[PDB]
Amino acid sequence: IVGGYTCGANTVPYQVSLNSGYHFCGGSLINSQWVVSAAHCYKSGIQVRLGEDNINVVEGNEQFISASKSIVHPSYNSNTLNNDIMLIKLKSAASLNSRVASISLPTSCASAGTQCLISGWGNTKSSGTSYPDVLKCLKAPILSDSSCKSAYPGQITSNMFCAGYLEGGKDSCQGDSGGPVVCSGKLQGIVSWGSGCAQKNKPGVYTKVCNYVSWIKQTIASN
């Protein structure tokens, strides 16, 4: 997160860190055994880390659970990043409490102007790499589809939306990938891609979760 603030320990209880010996992507807990992340964050050997604040210190509240299976959307296109969503099933269910809680899936898609909370342990520099120890947060609005397509002509599909600031300075970045975009308590997006981080007129592009609720529900129900 570039231009964000320190969230405060466990104030984002649904945030998870996907770890393979180091933090590589974020994710969201949607029930006690499933996490939603981005398809491009897929790899084998993933350990899901819940209740984290400082990812380099065991401070208490952490629960490290291995992933039993990762299900990348069947129509994921690694070249366009269209359908950049993945479900991870945990080996054991997590103990939910105030520090570890799931977030609700939406019933409707959000409108432009909706203010959302984006969080993660991704890079904090737009020019260079600085990775934080604790979780960073950024409040950002969903942009209109016309502004989004104007910024990324020919690269936005109906399964994507832009959120952020066209002036640059505040954005999500590499490492935040897979994590949550929550608006009015519902998970509306997944950090997917963007051109650099916090560059003028190049907002972040997110996977539009409201277009995948039936898929998520059907897939969880059959696995």
Ligand SMILES: NC(=[NH2+])c1ccc2[nH]c(-c3cc([C@@H](CC(=O)[O-])C(=O)[O-])cc(-c4ccccc4F)c3[O-])nc2c1
């Ligand atoms: N501007 C934004 N709002 C934004 C949002 C998500 C991003 N995710 C990434 C991202 C970038 C990389 C670099 C890799 C490098 O320079 O070392 C790249 O390929 O350009 C990699 C990943 C990535 C790829 C696979 C797994 C985990 C990852 F974070 C990104 O998500 N950039 C991002 C930028």
Ligand SMILES: [Ca+2]
């Ligand atoms: Ca920790």
Ligand SMILES: [Cl-]
């Ligand atoms: Cl277009």
